[PDB]
């Protein structure tokens, strides 16, 4: 990689390779994700993102996660980073949705992590929708996690007086 003359393309070929991952082995996959993250100057991105979303669908599937779960968390990390740099998009909204589906803490933690972050980040607009989304999600749901969720959000508050 310390061929820091680091050509565009090469980074790009990864996905192809990556496709192969669907024949799992997380551990390998995991190595990939880290590896993967790196190349992206917040670009070859979309095609990827899309692909990620594909992954995401794929991730849904019917699953009996045991290994891939892990991956997900990781992915999200990997993913997280990018965003920091980037301006990101709808894809993201989808996580929010996605997250609603889900049922385990670690994600909530991420989410929360996001809570924090976003709290810092504020360009805002999205949030509001999402807040709406959430409103649904929320209405649509119960749990400690949620319960907790409410608290912060509540804490947060703005309009629709």
């Amino acid at each position: 990689k310390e061929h820091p003359a680091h050509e565009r393309v090469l980074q790009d070929l990864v996905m192809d390779i990556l496709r192969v991952l669907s024949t799992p082995d997380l551990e390998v996959r995991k190595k990939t994700l880290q590896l993967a993250l790196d190349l992206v100057s917040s670009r070859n991105v979309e095609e990827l993102v899309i692909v990620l979303k594909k992954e995401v669908i794929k991730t849904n599937n019917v699953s009996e996660h045991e290994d891939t779960d892990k991956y997900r968390q990781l992915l999200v990390r990997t993913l997280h980073s990018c965003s920091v740099r980037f301006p990101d998009m709808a894809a993201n909204v989808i996580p929010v949705l996605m997250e609603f589906l889900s049922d385990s803490n670690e994600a909530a933690a991420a989410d929360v992590l996001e809570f924090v972050r976003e709290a810092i980040q504020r360009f805002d607009n999205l949030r509001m929708l999402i807040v709406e989304k959430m409103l649904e999600v929320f209405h649509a749901i119960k749990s400690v996690k949620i319960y907790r969720g409410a608290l912060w959000i509540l804490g947060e508050y703005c309009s629709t007086k």
């Binding site: 929360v112 809570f115 924090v116 907790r148 608290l151 912060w152 804490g155």
Partner: protein, 112 residues
Amino acid sequence: HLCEFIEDCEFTVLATRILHLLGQEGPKTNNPSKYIRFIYNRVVLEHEEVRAGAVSALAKFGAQNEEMLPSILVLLKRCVMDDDNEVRDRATFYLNVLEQKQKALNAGYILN
């Protein structure tokens, strides 16, 4: 004995009860450093909740102050402070609450 043992004799539930009681008692029985010493410990434990009691007990206490407390009482809330969002909030809020009344007044209303 209670303090120590309970610490390493566990059960959160006990703590609730005792907390509540202790909550009232404070500086009428002095021994500040120790008592502080304890109090810190009680908090030490995780649980936003476990942590929380030491502050609440404190309100009757703080207000009264003891063999050294008012100046310092003021200093302490500052020295000990926390994030963890709603745990953050607890610190912030108590503060914020604190922020909101002349602390002398503050003590009077809340206490009752």
